[PDB]
Design a protein around this ligand. Structure first.
Ligand SMILES: *Cc1c(COP(=O)(O)O)cnc(C)c1O
Length: 226
C-alpha cells in the first residue's frame, strides 16, 4: 500500500534526522517512480507526495503531461537518470530539476532549449564519488571548474550536488563517503549562491547519508514496491 509505505519511509527519515540532531524538515523525500505506472504516482499524490524522480525521458515526460492534463498543481519533477544530448530538449521543456549535470555541454544544451517563460531549471552537478564501474559524474577535482561554467547559464540554477556512491555494506564507509560529499557541498556553499541541495542517499544508506548532511534522499522500491 503506497500511502502506508510513504508513511513508513517518512518516519524513518524523521527518526534518522532527530537522532543526529537535525530537524526532519531539512530532509526532502524524493519519491523515485521510474518503471512505475502513473496510477501509482497518482496514489502517492493523493497521499501528499509532491516531488517525484524519473530516470528515462519519454517515460517521465508522458507522466508529466498526464498530471498536467489532470490539472494537478504543485509537483516537482526531477530527472535523475543519465542524460544523452539527443533527448535533452524534452528534459529542458518539461522537468523542474535535473540531478545529472556531469559535463558542460549537456548543461548548455539544457540552458539553450529551456523556454524563457519557465523558471530556471534547477540543476545539481553529479559527482562520481566512489564508483569505479560508473561512467557517470565528475571527479571532485573537476567540480570548481564545471560549477563556475554551469552557474553562468541563465536558464539554469545551480542548486548543489548529487552522487550515487558505489554500493557499500559497511555503515562506516557509507558515512565516510557521504561525508566527502557533504564537505564538497559545504565548500561549494561558501562561494556560490543558493546552494541548498545535496541529493544523497537511498534506502540502504539512508541513515549515514542523513547523518553526514544530505538534504534529499531518493527512495523508489520502499515506496512503490517491486
Ligand atoms: C532507481 C533510483 C533510485 C531508487 O531506487 P530504489 O533502490 O528502488 O529505491 C534512487 N536514485 C536513483 C538515481 C535511481 O536511479
Amino acid at each position: 500500500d503506497i500511502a502506508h509505505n510513504l508513511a513508513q519511509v517518512r518516519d524513518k527519515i524523521s527518526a534518522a534526522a532527530t537522532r543526529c540532531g537535525r530537524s526532519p524538515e531539512e530532509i526532502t523525500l524524493l519519491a523515485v517512480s521510474k518503471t512505475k505506472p502513473a496510477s501509482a504516482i497518482a496514489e502517492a499524490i493523493d497521499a501528499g507526495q509532491r516531488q517525484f524522480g524519473e530516470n528515462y525521458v519519454q517515460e517521465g515526460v508522458d507522466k508529466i503531461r498526464h498530471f498536467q492534463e489532470l490539472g494537478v498543481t504543485g509537483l516537482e519533477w526531477h530527472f535523475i537518470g543519465p542524460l544523452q544530448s539527443n533527448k535533452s530538449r524534452l528534459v529542458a521543456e518539461h522537468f523542474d530539476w535535473c540531478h545529472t549535470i556531469d559535463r558542460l555541454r549537456i548543461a548548455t544544451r539544457l540552458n539553450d532549449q529551456r523556454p524563457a517563460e519557465l523558471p530556471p531549471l534547477n540543476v545539481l552537478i553529479q559527482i562520481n564519488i566512489s564508483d569505479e564501474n560508473s561512467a557517470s559524474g565528475i571527479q571532485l577535482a573537476e567540480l570548481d571548474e564545471l560549477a563556475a561554467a554551469v552557474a553562468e547559464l541563465p536558464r539554469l540554477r545551480l542548486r548543489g550536488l548529487m552522487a550515487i556512491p558505489a554500493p557499500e555494506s559497511e555503515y562506516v564507509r557509507q558515512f565516510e563517503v557521504a561525508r566527502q560529499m557533504a564537505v564538497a557541498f559545504a565548500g561549494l556553499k561558501t562561494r556560490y549562491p543558493h546552494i541548498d541541495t545535496l541529493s544523497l542517499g537511498m534506502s540502504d544508506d539512508m541513515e549515514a547519508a542523513i547523518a553526514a548532511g544530505s538534504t534529499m534522499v531518493r527512495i523508489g522500491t520502499a515506496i512503490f514496491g517491486a
